[PDB]
Amino acid sequence: PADQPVHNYMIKRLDRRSLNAAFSIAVEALGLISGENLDGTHISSAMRL
Amino acid sequence: VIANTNLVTALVMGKAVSNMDDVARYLLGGGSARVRADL
């Protein structure tokens, strides 16, 4: 005897990956960015730049 | 203070002289109050 045409379904699930990268900055310059350690000079301006 | 001739000096070189403006202009031609005391 003959056969009937077949059917079928399916699913594929995802998977989780990630990227990351460190970006450390130091205290000596962190005091200069935020202006806390900033002094009123003509020399501290250049170090801030 | 250090500015505009001693500034670049101390920044790139590492040293800075006191009376820089005078030596630069030379190389290339370019009230009180009273107080008591015991004298």
Side-chain angles (χ1 to χ4, degrees):
Chain A
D3 51 355
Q4 301 82 346
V6 303
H7 281 236
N8 54 4
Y9 309 90
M10 63 192 74
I11 67 172
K12 314 170 67 62
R13 302 189 312 269
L14 282 152
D15 58 337
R16 310 261 190 223
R17 297 185 172 80
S18 43
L19 303 188
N20 42 2
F23 185 51
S24 68
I25 76 181
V27 50
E28 43 198 6
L30 182 61
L32 265 296
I33 290 291
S34 87
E36 157 199 341
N37 199 291
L38 195 143
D39 302 354
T41 69
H42 284 169
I43 179 171
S44 42
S45 79
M47 280 291 278
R48 178 167 194 274
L49 265 298
Chain B
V1 298
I2 43 181
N4 75 61
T5 318
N6 300 95
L7 176 47
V8 55
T9 320
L11 279 183
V12 296
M13 312 306 306
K15 328 167 178 296
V17 70
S18 309
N19 56 351
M20 179 70 101
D21 60 336
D22 292 330
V23 75
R25 192 166 67 157
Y26 161 75
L27 285 174
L28 59 99
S32 297
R34 156 179 302 162
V35 75
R36 72 186 177 281
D38 294 331
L39 291 197

